[PDB]
Amino acid sequence: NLEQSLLVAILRQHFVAWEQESGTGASQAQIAIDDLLPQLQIYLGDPGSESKERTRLLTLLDQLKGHGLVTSPDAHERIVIRPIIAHLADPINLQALLAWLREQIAQQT
Amino acid sequence: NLEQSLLVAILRQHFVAWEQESGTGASQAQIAIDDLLPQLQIYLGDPGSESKERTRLLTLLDQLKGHGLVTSPDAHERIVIRPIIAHLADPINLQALLAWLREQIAQQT
Amino acid sequence: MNQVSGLAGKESFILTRIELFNWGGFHGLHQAAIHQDGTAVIGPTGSGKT
Amino acid sequence: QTLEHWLNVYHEGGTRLLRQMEKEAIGLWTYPNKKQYLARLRDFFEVGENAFTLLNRAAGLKQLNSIDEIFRELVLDDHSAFDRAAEVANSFDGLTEIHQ
Amino acid sequence: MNQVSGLAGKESFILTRIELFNWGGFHGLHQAAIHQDGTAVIGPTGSGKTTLVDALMTLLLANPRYNLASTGGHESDRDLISYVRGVSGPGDGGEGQSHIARPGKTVTGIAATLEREGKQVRLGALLWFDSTSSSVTDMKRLWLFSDNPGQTLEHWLNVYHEGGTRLLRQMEKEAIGLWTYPNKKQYLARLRDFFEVGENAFTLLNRAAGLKQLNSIDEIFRELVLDDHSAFDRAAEVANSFDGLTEIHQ
Amino acid sequence: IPLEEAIQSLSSILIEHVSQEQYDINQDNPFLQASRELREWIKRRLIVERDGRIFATDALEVAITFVESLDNRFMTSTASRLSTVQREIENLETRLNPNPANRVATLRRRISELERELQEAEAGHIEVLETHQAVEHIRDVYNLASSLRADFRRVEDSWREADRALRQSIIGEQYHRGDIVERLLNDQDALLNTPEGRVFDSFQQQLRQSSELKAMSERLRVILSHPSASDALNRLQRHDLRWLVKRLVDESQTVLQARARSERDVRGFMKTGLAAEHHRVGHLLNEFLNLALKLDWQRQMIRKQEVPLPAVGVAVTGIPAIERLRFKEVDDEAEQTLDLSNHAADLTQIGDDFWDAFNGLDREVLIQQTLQLLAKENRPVGLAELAELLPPAHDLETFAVWIGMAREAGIEVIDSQREFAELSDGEGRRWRFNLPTTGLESQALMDIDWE
Amino acid sequence: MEENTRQRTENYISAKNQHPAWILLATRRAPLVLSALKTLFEKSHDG
Amino acid sequence: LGAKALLDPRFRLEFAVSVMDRQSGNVIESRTGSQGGSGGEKEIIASYVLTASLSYALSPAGSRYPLFGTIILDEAFSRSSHAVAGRIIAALREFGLHAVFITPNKEMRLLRDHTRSAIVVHRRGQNSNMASLSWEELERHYQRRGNA
Amino acid sequence: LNRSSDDGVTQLLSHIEHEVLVIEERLNELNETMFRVDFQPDRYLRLDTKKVVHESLRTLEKAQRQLNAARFVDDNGESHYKALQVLVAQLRDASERNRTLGAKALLDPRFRLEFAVSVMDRQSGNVIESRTGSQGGSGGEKEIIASYVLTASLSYALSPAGSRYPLFGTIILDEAFSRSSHAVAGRIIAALREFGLHAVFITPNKEMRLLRDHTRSAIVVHRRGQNSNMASLSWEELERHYQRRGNA
Amino acid sequence: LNRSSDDGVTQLLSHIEHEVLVIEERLNELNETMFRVDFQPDRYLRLDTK
């Protein structure tokens, strides 16, 4: 669902940024949870309670881990992006989704 | 959980009794809510209301149907015991728990 | 020495009883009152004081 | 309500029974998680957590070293600003990265 | 309860007498004796009871944990000059030195006497300030050892008053069974040779004096019994040389 | 308030107003009601909670300031206010005057004024504020300075909004690196240009010369000590003003936090010297995100739409094998009844050593008995004579006590000459003692206290 | 001090139910009336 | 040390203690640099400071007397003579506290005086017990032990 | 590289192992001396030790083995320098982190081995308990073990070369029994007697009951303001009899 | 950059200084409380900081 897809997009951006650093390299695409919350706040808004948004983000991350795209959190509030993301956010899939979503917005009028 | 174990045990004994009545596989076993509720309350007691009684009964029935043991009650509140029940894993454990249950029914009254 | 104790127990809460059970070395049930004027606790070295 | 009563009810029924008598009785509450209880304690006695934290570390103070140790450890609430310095340095490094 | 102490006398020396002078708050001469079978010490807290023990321990280690028992594990709270000065802490913010008993040019001494099977040893030491400066470098001292009871701390103080420490050096050679070391290491070596025991034993003794807090069974050995002699400085120098090695390789 | 603390405090406060029955309220769980109300106010943006704590939003600050400006309000039409305005208008005019001669004349008259004040003060005729007028003169500075917090309450919000705008704009695919740096600089400068921006900048300039802010804080500390302060302000208002400088310093931190937060996503975005495929997917994602903003995220049903993304990394599990079933165990049915019996101790076990300690020599009674006895003896008395005239039941500690009294009183003790005494313990075994020569005297001994 | 806190709620109820300004702010037409009044007196020298 | 001295507030300040005469502006004593050395003096000083701070922290704002006055004190009397133990008890009482002292069966002479009850406890192998006795009910027990 | 080989990490690790073996020798000889007295009516104390199982030391042994392999395979010393760099990097990591226990395991000889104590039967030598009777110090109980072991070690260290008895018997204790009951300080002094160490006790007029028994003289110290003085007091049991045809 | 990071750093230093002042005020408050009780027969304790 498109919330999971938004988190997927952000994760894919972070993943490609990581892959630049050392090519494909290892599977250690590490990120801090505090980095994601600022991103989501822009789209999902600000419910005005930092803890509430943290819980929301953790719920989404749990769903994604259910889809196998992210490791569960750890003691340092870090997660590592599963490489499987590269084949779900495949530019072909991204463009198909983008066309569908452009259609959606056009209809929204 | 013990509630589900009791329910499956009672359904298993009912199914085998029905197969004695009509032979093997001649007809799918059945039971109504009318007969059900008393037999469950025999060992479980009053959860707090009749509404809660039926709620719990239907919840366990739905979970069993998820496990494939039973169908959901029809318009007349009668379920069909799925023939699959004949091939459970450890019927000896069921018989042992049934022995414990039939001991406790007499002990506590 | 002790005569200032009059004000000790007026405006504050004071610990006056501890009921214990199956805690630490104290098996079963136990109790121990505490006098509001000051109470010591005494026992052999390593006898369940701490 | 006394400890004896609590244990008696705990065993007589299940843990569920405890939270049932919580409702039935008067002047009795429970908090299955500790912090929800310690907040009630601090409120009822109108003292911040630092007071009890001092009480406990005071009950057994036997090091009893120089005064500076007493204060710096037991007395004063902990508000060191290491993480803030870390944040300041990190942001400065980020801006230097922009400049580079 | 203490009958074995006589056999220990047949197998060891035991301290029987302590003489002080201008040490701590104990102005002027002071003395004490110790029964063969062991003694206690008593006095209201803050009266010099640990002061005496420190006075003894100054003659047995290069630099012991002065006043160790007060803190326990943590740093020593005092130094030789403070005792020689009769210090009693900063009596006021203005620091008028009234709390200091001997701020001026004075003398000081400590003496111990031990016995094994009647035969008697006698330690000693003289500390003297010829100026109001209170730096450790100005702590002119002279340790003394002797196996003859004839030598007495009273006699040493009287000789010092009669003339400079050179008189002490002369009577060292004139007096049978006497020694004086202007530095501590010679004295400590002589003591350890006499007792056929290494200095780590006396360090352990100082540990024992203020034996205090510890957490578990391992800490006993680790922090009381053994001498760590950790080689971290070896690590530092190894890394330093390896730095040049790595530079050459680069 | 830490949130767990706020819930309970507000539950208690609600319990108080259950007597205000004209307002409908829940009367079965005043704790749950508290949390529900707290959540509601979170929704209204009345209170914003961060890092687990809670803080009052500017809206609630202003609302409070409203009701407090009703009957219990403070007043500003004051001679103190007029003095302030007069002085500060003089200052403003003199500053705005560009003619140097006019400034010279103004300073020549001000210097003479202050010199006259100095002459009066040196004459011993110093004058204080009428102690009663002090209450109003302090209320004046309090009310005057109370505005600054209400102003930072909005400086923070303005910079937060600027940062949020920078975020939602940086997503733009049309934006390139040069656009982003330019927008950062322009946004920050424009924010600094607005009035609140100049407020923040002036406050910052004060910090460079901290001497003045610290001097102000010290003066305020002195002021609130003067007795009249207690009449003018309660403890709360004094608590604020005493640390107004600190509360401003701390409050500005959020501004710097927003600034650094925006710089974070500038930095994380300028590093885009990518390879080919990464450059392609970057454009794809940026365009998709720019599309994303247009939707209505707040809507639930918009949110739970199903995208057409293909199923990859698909997994299959939970094959419903009937044989996989297992069943409950109850065999540990043995009931361990209660050990409610009272196991209170019986003193028979108590070892004799504990009793021996329980009979510790009472020092003070020994002091009193010695003073009494030496009163009637009225002469020097050695310790042996004391034992003879007084049986030391608990033995050694007595000798120490007597010699301690001697020493405390400055009584001479000649350790080199000795006396002796004989005694016996509680079980009859005899003992002998060696003691120093000394003499106790009642008059000198009782001349000093004891404990 | 915080003993008055119990009474402060009654004080605020009084203010809400009687004080003119507060009652004005609660009216369905509060902004229009307040704006009109503001404009009216915005030009005053005195009464 | 440097890191604390920079980014930890409290480490910028010394915490010397001093004694003030009630009826004079002099400073009778100060204790910093050298920490006094005395095993008792340190004990009394620390106990008094800690008790005062604890009382202040335990008191609701504006109240002289603490709302929660029970302070559990272990045998910090270990370094305490009787002469200073009495002072500790007096001070603790004057701050409005109520002290439940613990001690290993030693230094009970002054406890008999400056306290009114006690809890005796038993060490019985892998077990323990407790009993609440007033000093006099214990005195009679000691007398009975003396008799038979 | 070769000039740093002898002075390098391997020699340091050998030195540390030599120190550990010295510690083992000391522990063994001490444990022998504990056979000469009793910790309990029918028990004597025994000391044990094992090598610490911290994985950091295991990584170190892996590195040292690999260095041994590379020290005699010739590539102009590339692999030798690689292994030496790895080892010295770990060593520097430990040195910087000296305070934490991980580094102490490497650089601190004491931490190289963990210790334990066993209640041994004096008669059969069988084990009754293999560690302290308390997990953490149960108040005065940690005084028992600590003082017992320290007195033991001090006696052993004070014994001349090969002497079964200490040539220096006068231990000095200050605030001796600060956290010990009578039933504990009594056993402490009894142990001191067993090891044959003359004792001197300091106390703030505490536990006078026990000192009255287990000593014969006391030195009184008192402070008149900014001054103090002293006196020597003593006692002894008279020889004629305890009492006339009575209790002893 | 010279503006923003300078602002952050100076602000943090001033925050540290204000924490120090708060500690000093706390010391004064405690000193007041300890004026209430006699440390010695005719003396009371007071804390001074540097």
Ligand SMILES: Nc1ncnc2c1ncn2[C@@H]1O[C@H](COP(=O)(O)OP(=O)(O)O)[C@@H](O)[C@H]1O
């Ligand atoms: N984790 C533990 N560590 C040490 N002792 C423990 C522990 N748990 C229980 N104990 C038991 O509890 C007792 C604690 O001793 P205690 O009397 O409270 O100390 P103190 O000597 O100061 O009085 C011990 O006798 C011991 O049997």
Ligand SMILES: Nc1ncnc2c1ncn2[C@@H]1O[C@H](COP(=O)(O)OP(=O)(O)O)[C@@H](O)[C@H]1O
């Ligand atoms: N060298 C010193 N440095 C600091 N204070 C000292 C020193 N010497 C004496 N004092 C003071 O003089 C007394 C010394 O007595 P001391 O034996 O050290 O105390 P305690 O009886 O607890 O062992 C104490 O009151 C101490 O405060």
